[PDB]
Structures are given as structure tokens and as C-alpha cells.
Amino acid sequence: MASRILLNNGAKMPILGLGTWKSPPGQVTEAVKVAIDVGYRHIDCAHVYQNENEVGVAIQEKLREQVVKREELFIVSKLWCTYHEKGLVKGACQKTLSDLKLDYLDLYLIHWPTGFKPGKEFFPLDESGNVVPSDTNILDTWAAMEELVDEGLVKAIGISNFNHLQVEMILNKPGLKYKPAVNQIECHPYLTQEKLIQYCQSKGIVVTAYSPLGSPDRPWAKPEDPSLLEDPRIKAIAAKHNKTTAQVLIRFPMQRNLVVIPKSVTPERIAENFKVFDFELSSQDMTTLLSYNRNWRVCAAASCTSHKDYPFHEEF
Numbered sequence: 001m002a003s004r005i006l007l008n009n010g011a012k013m014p015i016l017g018l019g020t021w022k023s024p025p026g027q028v029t030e031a032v033k034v035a036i037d038v039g040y041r042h043i044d045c046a047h048v049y050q051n052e053n054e055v056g057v058a059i060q061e062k063l064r065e066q067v068v069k070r071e072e073l074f075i076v077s078k079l080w081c082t083y084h085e086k087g088l089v090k091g092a093c094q095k096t097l098s099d100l101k102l103d104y105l106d107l108y109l110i111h112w113p114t115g116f117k118p119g120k121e122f123f124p125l126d127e128s129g130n131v132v133p134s135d136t137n138i139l140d141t142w143a144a145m146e147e148l149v150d151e152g153l154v155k156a157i158g159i160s161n162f163n164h165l166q167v168e169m170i171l172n173k174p175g176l177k178y179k180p181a182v183n184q185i186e187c188h189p190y191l192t193q194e195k196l197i198q199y200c201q202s203k204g205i206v207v208t209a210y211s212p213l214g215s216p217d218r219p220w221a222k223p224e225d226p227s228l229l230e231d232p233r234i235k236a237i238a239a240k241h242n243k244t245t246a247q248v249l250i251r252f253p254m255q256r257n258l259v260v261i262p263k264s265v266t267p268e269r270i271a272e273n274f275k276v277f278d279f280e281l282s283s284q285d286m287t288t289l290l291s292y293n294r295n296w297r298v299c300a301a302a303s304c305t306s307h308k309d310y311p312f313h314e315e316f
């Protein structure tokens with residue numbers, strides 16, 4: 001397994017990256033430093049995660065130490081929902097660049113297709129708890145993303161949490177200048193995403209799998225919820241390969257030609273999770289893992305279920 005996948009902008013993207021959602025600000029600097037020391041070259045970030053300054057401290061210190069050159073890193077961030085307006089996209093990108101202490105991003109994603117009213121709140125609500133939408137459509141937001149490429153702020157642009165009809169809308173955009181390079185979506189054995197993955201791959205869009213371990217630290221987890229890391233069937237595949245359950249869960253998307261971004265702040269697990277380039281799952285293992293699909297989706301917001309661009313009413 002090669003370590004990088006070729007994107008439709010001509011750049012190569014490391015297939016394994018470090019996730020940073022929920023990584024506490026007092027722990028994420030050391031997590032990213034350790035990650036870079038043990039071989040990670042791709043970090044997944046977002047303004048909404050509220051920890052980009054601290055991620056940036058780690059990146060800048062490893063660049064200063066000459067542990068890694070900037071060209072060897074692949075740094076990803078995402079445009080939050082309250083910045084979908086034409087006049088706000090550049091400043092949102094610039095704030096992320098400032099915080100990460102970078103002069104460009106390797107990839108910048110529209111975080112969700114649902115735009116919200118701009119303001120200080122990340123989820124502006126009406127009095128009944130519905131999110132307050134923006135009227136800016138995804139195509140105009142895409143044009144604003146294209147400008148960032150042409151201004152040198154980002155090397156590649158993409159999307160996240162877009163359903164196949166929303167991907168198609170961009171691909172069919174009048175005057176489209178740059179195709180999305182990536183669609184970053186939730187993907188794991190309980191939400192295997194075959195239909196959306198095949199659609200994106202057929203169009204040359206690389207898929208990144210988020211929450212590959214099932215996001216057991218998500219704030220809305222319940223004690224009774226399904227658990228990938230504790231599923232005895234997955235544990236059995238791991239034992240047969242002399243690997244951990246997490247290592248199987250990371251290798252699985254890699255063998256589907258996906259990028260994968262497991263999150264950890266635990267130094268031992270950060271190192272463990274990278275040790276996935278020296279074993280193979282068989283075709284039978286892969287099909288068996290795919291068979292565990294239950295359409296169990298962990299990442300969505302109830303406040304958004306009436307937004308016109310809510311992505312998960314469609315089958316895929």
C-alpha cells in the first residue's frame with residue numbers, strides 16, 4: 001500500500017491522517033507533535049473544533065525543528081456553516097491560516113452543505129431550536145472556494161457531508177472551474193457508504209472516511225450504543241492478523257481506496273494507529289466487514305433536519 005493517493009488537482013494526499021475534533025486544547029499540541037514524530041504527515045482540522053491555534057503551535061514547532069518540511073505536510077481545514085457567504089469565505093480561510101500559522105492549506109473543505117446565518121454563534125437558533133439558515137446556495141459558496149485556489153491560499157478544495165445529488169450539483173455547476181478533490185464523509189463498518197463512495201470514486205473524487213472508529217467520544221454517545229472497538233466479530237479479525245481492533249478499523253478504509261483520519265490524544269494510540277502499512281485484510285475480511293453495515297450514522301444535527309440542504313434525507 002502506497003502512503004499517498006493522487007488527487008484530481010495533481011497533488012498527493014497521505015491516506016492516513018490525524019483527526020483533531022474533541023482533542024482538548026491543552027492536549028492537542030503534544031498529540032500533533034507526537035503524531036509528526038511517529039510518521040503522520042496529514043492533520044485534519046476545522047475552525048469549529050476551536051483548537052486550530054494549538055494544532056498550529058505543534059506544526060510550527062516541528063517545521064522549526066526541521067523534523068519535516070512544509071511540502072511534506074498535508075494540512076486540511078474546513079469552512080464552517082456560518083461563513084458560506086461570498087464576502088466571508090476568504091476571511092474564514094485567513095483566520096484558519098493565521099491560527100495554524102501557515103501560508104497555505106493543502107485542502108480546504110466546505111464543512112457541511114448547510115449554510116447558517118453569520119454571526120458569533122456557530123449554531124444560530126430560532127426560539128424553537130431550529131438552526132437559522134443562510135440563503136447562500138452551495139454553488140455560490142463553491143465559486144468562493146475556487147477563488148481561494150486562484151489567490152494561493154489553498155492548493156485544493158473539496159466538500160464534506162455532501163450527498164450524491166449535492167456532489168452532482170457542483171459537478172454540473174455552470175462555469176465550474178475546479179472540481180471537488182475530496183468528499184469527506186462518515187464511514188465505518190456500521191455505515192459503509194457503498195453507494196456514495198462508488199459515485200464519488202466514479203467521478204475521480206477521493207473519499208475521506210471520518211469517525212472510522214465510530215467516534216466513541218462523541219458528546220451524544222449513549223451507554224447502550226453499538227461499539228465498533230468492542231464488536232467481537234471485528235476483534236476476531238484483528239486477533240487473526242495479530243493487530244488491534246483499531247488497526248483493522250483503520251486498514252479497512254485504506255483498502256477501499258479511501259483516506260482515513262482516526263483521532264487520538266493518547267500518545268501510545270497515535271503511534272499504534274499508524275502501524276497499519278504492514279498487513280493486509282483479505283477480500284473475505286473486507287466483504288465480512290462490509291456486511292456489518294446497519295446504516296448507523298453518528299454525526300448529524302437535529303437542529304438542521306429542516307434546512308433545505310440537510311444532506312441525510314436522501315438515501316445517499
Ligand SMILES: NC(=O)c1ccc[n+]([C@@H]2O[C@H](COP(=O)([O-])OP(=O)(O)OC[C@H]3O[C@@H](n4cnc5c(N)ncnc54)[C@H](OP(=O)(O)O)[C@@H]3O)[C@@H](O)[C@H]2O)c1
Nearest residue numbers: 019020021210211212213214215217246262263264265266
Ligand atoms: N467532516 C466532518 O463533518 C467530520 C465529522 C466528524 C469527524 N471528522 C474528523 O474525523 C476525525 C475522526 O473522527 P472522530 O473524532 O469522530 O472519531 P474516531 O476517530 O472514530 O474515534 C476517536 C475516539 O477513538 C479513540 N481511539 C483512538 N484510537 C484508539 C485505539 N487505538 N484504541 C482505542 N480507542 C482509540 C479516541 O480516544 P483518545 O483520543 O482518548 O485516545 C477517541 O475517543 C475527527 O477528529 C475529525 O478530524 C470530521
Ligand SMILES: O=C(O)COc1cc(F)ccc1C(=O)NCc1cccc(C(=O)O)c1
Nearest residue numbers: 021048049081112114299300301304310311
Ligand atoms: O461537524 C464535525 O466535524 C463534527 O461535529 C461537530 C463538531 C463541532 F465542533 C461542533 C458541532 C459538530 C456537529 O454538531 N456536527 C454535526 C453537524 C454540523 C453542522 C451541520 C449539520 C447538519 O446536519 O446539517 C450537522
